[PDB]
Amino acid sequence: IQLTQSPLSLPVSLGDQASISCRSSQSLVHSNGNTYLHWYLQKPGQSPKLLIYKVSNRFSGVPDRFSGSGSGTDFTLKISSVEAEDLGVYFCSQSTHVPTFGGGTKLEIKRADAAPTVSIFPPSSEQLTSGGASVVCFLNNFYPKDINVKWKIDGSERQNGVLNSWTDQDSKDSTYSMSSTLTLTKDEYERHNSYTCEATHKTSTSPIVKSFNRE
Amino acid sequence: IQLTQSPLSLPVSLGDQASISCRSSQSLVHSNGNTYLHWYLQKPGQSPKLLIYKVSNRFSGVPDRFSGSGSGTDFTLKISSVEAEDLGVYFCSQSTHVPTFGGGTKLEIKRADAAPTVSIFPPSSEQLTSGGASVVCFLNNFYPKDINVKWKIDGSERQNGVLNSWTDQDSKDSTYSMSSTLTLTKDEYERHNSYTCEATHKTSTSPIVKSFNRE
Amino acid sequence: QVQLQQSGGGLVQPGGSMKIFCAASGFTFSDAWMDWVRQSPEKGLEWVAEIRNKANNHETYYAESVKGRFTITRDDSKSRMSLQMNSLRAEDTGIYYCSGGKVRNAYWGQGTTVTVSSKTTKAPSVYPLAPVSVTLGCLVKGYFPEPVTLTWNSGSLSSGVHTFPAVLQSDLYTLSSSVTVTSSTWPSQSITCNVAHPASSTKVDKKIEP
Amino acid sequence: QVQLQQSGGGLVQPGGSMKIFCAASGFTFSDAWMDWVRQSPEKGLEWVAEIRNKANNHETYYAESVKGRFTITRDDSKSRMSLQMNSLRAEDTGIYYCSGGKVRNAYWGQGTTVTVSSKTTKAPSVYPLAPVSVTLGCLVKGYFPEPVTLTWNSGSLSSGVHTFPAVLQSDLYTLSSSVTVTSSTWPSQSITCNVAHPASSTKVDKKIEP
Ligand SMILES: CC(=O)N[C@@H]1[C@@H](O)[C@@H](O)[C@@H](CO)O[C@@H]1O
Ligand SMILES: CC(=O)N[C@@H]1[C@@H](O)[C@@H](O)[C@@H](CO)O[C@@H]1O
Numbered sequence A, B: 001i002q003l004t005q006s007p008l009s010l011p012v013s014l015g016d017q018a019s020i021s022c023r024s025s026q027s028l029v030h031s032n033g034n035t036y037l038h039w040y041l042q043k044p045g046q047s048p049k050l051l052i053y054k055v056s057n058r059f060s061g062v063p064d065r066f067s068g069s070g071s072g073t074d075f076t077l078k079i080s081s082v083e084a085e086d087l088g089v090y091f092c093s094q095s096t097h098v099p100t101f102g103g104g105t106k107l108e109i110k111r112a113d114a115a116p117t118v119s120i121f122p123p124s125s126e127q128l129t130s131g132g133a134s135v136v137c138f139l140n141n142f143y144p145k146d147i148n149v150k151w152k153i154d155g156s157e158r159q160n161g162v163l164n165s166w167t168d169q170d171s172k173d174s175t176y177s178m179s180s181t182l183t184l185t186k187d188e189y190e191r192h193n194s195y196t197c198e199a200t201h202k203t204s205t206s207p208i209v210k211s212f213n214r215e
Numbered sequence C, D: 001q002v003q004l005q006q007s008g009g010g011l012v013q014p015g016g017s018m019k020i021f022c023a024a025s026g027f028t029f030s031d032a033w034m035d036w037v038r039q040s041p042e043k044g045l046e047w048v049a050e051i052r053n054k055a056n057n058h059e060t061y062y063a064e065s066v067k068g069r070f071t072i073t074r075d076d077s078k079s080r081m082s083l084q085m086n087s088l089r090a091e092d093t094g095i096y097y098c099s100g101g102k103v104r105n106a107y108w109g110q111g112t113t114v115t116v117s118s119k120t121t122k123a124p125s126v127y128p129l130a131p132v133s134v135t136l137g138c139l140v141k142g143y144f145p146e147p148v149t150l151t152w153n154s155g156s157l158s159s160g161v162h163t164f165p166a167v168l169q170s171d172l173y174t175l176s177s178s179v180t181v182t183s184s185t186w187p188s189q190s191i192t193c194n195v196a197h198p199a200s201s202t203k204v205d206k207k208i209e210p
């Protein structure tokens, strides 16, 4: 049996209510009358944590803000008065038959818009003294999570050899961070001298530019 | 110095390989160059028998199916083509410092799966004539090892006064046997007439039941 | 306090074997229904195996994908259970979680990483990132497999820190961390990047020099 | 053929004393590093004491928990060693093995049981278990201390026998055994249970009558 979750993502303002749905391909009603449906929350960097079992039974420790409902093949998790710590991926699961999970629903917290603090770093002497070259760019504490990063070498865009990494939403301030690493051969790196990390974000009308020149 | 042995239980099929670890809280290497780590096997009903000494040296009479390896604080016993005669509890030990032992690993031979043969026995004339009453139930040659025995007197369950005992795994057929003894006072025994031994085992959706009627 | 701590994970070659364990405390183990659940980019959360109550004869059930290859085990008196894996495949790779309780799946451990590889284990190169208030960095490049632990000033420096999830490319991982302090703080006070990579027994300190 | 036979164990009251012995043959005793090792459900196997080579002048060492209470001694001319135990505690209870060889711990005896008590030694009651192909039983009830020896037709009948380990309840052991034969065997051929309990000096034979 498959369980389908919607929506894939869910933006919500603090204090507001949120609603998730998870659908089974078969009825979850066991022959013994009970419906074995679970809701979990997986906060960033942590394992899943049981919220609700048997459809609407709130597990020990779970705030009454979380409530389960539904029957047959249709179930819903409601969160009223969303706190920032609520963010993460929500999962439903059925153990009426052989255990299966939903694909999860990521809850995102709405906030006021924040420009990224951008910082660029040339390869370290240590790395260079090993025949390698990595240019690194941090784009920290921004919102919304949509951001476009370009690497420009001598004005010309480079997409090969880029490694991007995002942090999950930080419940502390509800922002996002990002790291972009441009890796080149030592010889290629020394063939140019202008290096640029370029971010396009809602918070700025023009590209947010951070550059350095070699020598 | 502690010798941490993993795992506690090791189910392996005939012919397959089994691997056992024991780990020391300190290096087992002695300042003289030698590492004094032993492996033992304790078959059911017998004393520990040395398999390997000094990390990898087989003792006389030990087949080279058994091999030891490792160094410093990390050591491994390997058994290829596991034979049923291999079943039992394996121990490591070190005598580099004050001698200590691992907590052992029980090698269990995998096999098909068998339902128990159940036999119930009324109190003997001899016991009754002395004022005592014991009802006995044998569950023989079953696999796997977990099993539930419920005693019913006149349809009602009776859990106080029950004595249970399991044999070790039998290397002849790789099964387990169990004895359950319900002890009542004689008067209490003669106040009822239906006595039931109820065996719930993996091998059947319903219990194997055995009973007798006084009179 | 309820605690589920996994252990024994790591790197294995395809066709290889591995044993992982779960140590339980803070609840009556024998009463608890236990599970192994694994997580991966593909497949997401997928149930692996279960071992039931003693009341329920420690009955075991396996996902069909691991049936015959994985053996689940438990010792109630030791409050311990294990997953002993054989003939491991690339898709067995994932984060393995120990889960259990009187209520099924009530508790979950931190998880242990199971990675079936062929790739060889490599120590990371640790590069200091000095700036061109002030933001410093640490680049951790070319290690296999996961995980590494990165810290700043042995943990003493935690606020203003952003550490990013490792990313794999050509059999190698790279990791980065940034820390933002005030100009009055550095280079006046030394700031040093600490990285451990158990798989290859590496611990590296890199001081951020102007 | 190397042989090690322990003896002299048994039941003693807490605070009591006891001496156990090991007799050896099949090897040059004076060349042998000898040990005493005990085993119990709790603690498992613990090294107790050692006594070294003649070459090492019979130097002796003790586990810290028995230091001062136990004395290990040997006589090479008699291929014999002994362990004198004073002020025994409940946790001194277990199976004591004699062990030794040119190679340390190469050989192990059958062990001898040391049980420190308070509980009173008690003769068992032996009851024949006749059936309601065919399975017969023998119940050995209310004895102390261990062990008893149970045999069928004096050990003639070994195939199809299941002897279950004594279980202790309220200072008293019960032991049982079953034997399964073919219908054409019994009751035509007699089958009898033989039980010995040295501690109380009882030898009894119970014939299973239809
Ligand atoms: C209602 C219930 O307990 N169902 C269980 C299911 O959870 C799972 O344990 C399966 C074996 O994997 O057996 C049952 O079908
Ligand atoms: C290598 C060696 O001889 N080690 C012995 C150890 O075996 C044990 O005899 C102990 C005294 O109990 O002394 C030494 O540490």
Ligand SMILES: [Mg+2]
Residues within 6 Å of the ligand: A064
């Ligand atoms: Mg309320």
Ligand SMILES: [Mg+2]
Residues within 6 Å of the ligand: A064, A065
């Ligand atoms: Mg409320």
Ligand SMILES: [Mg+2]
Residues within 6 Å of the ligand: B001, B002
């Ligand atoms: Mg200690």
Ligand SMILES: [Mg+2]
Residues within 6 Å of the ligand: B141, B170, B172, B173, B175
């Ligand atoms: Mg048998």
Ligand SMILES: [Mg+2]
Residues within 6 Å of the ligand: A036, A038, A053, A054, A095, C103, C104
């Ligand atoms: Mg449940």
Ligand SMILES: [Zn+2]
Residues within 6 Å of the ligand: A126, A129
């Ligand atoms: Zn260098």
Ligand SMILES: [Zn+2]
Residues within 6 Å of the ligand: B001, B002
């Ligand atoms: Zn210690």
Ligand SMILES: [Zn+2]
Residues within 6 Å of the ligand: B188, B191, B192
């Ligand atoms: Zn009654």
Ligand SMILES: [Zn+2]
Residues within 6 Å of the ligand: B146, C057, C058
């Ligand atoms: Zn079990």
Ligand SMILES: [Zn+2]
Residues within 6 Å of the ligand: B036, B037, B038, B053, B054, B095, D103, D104
């Ligand atoms: Zn040795």
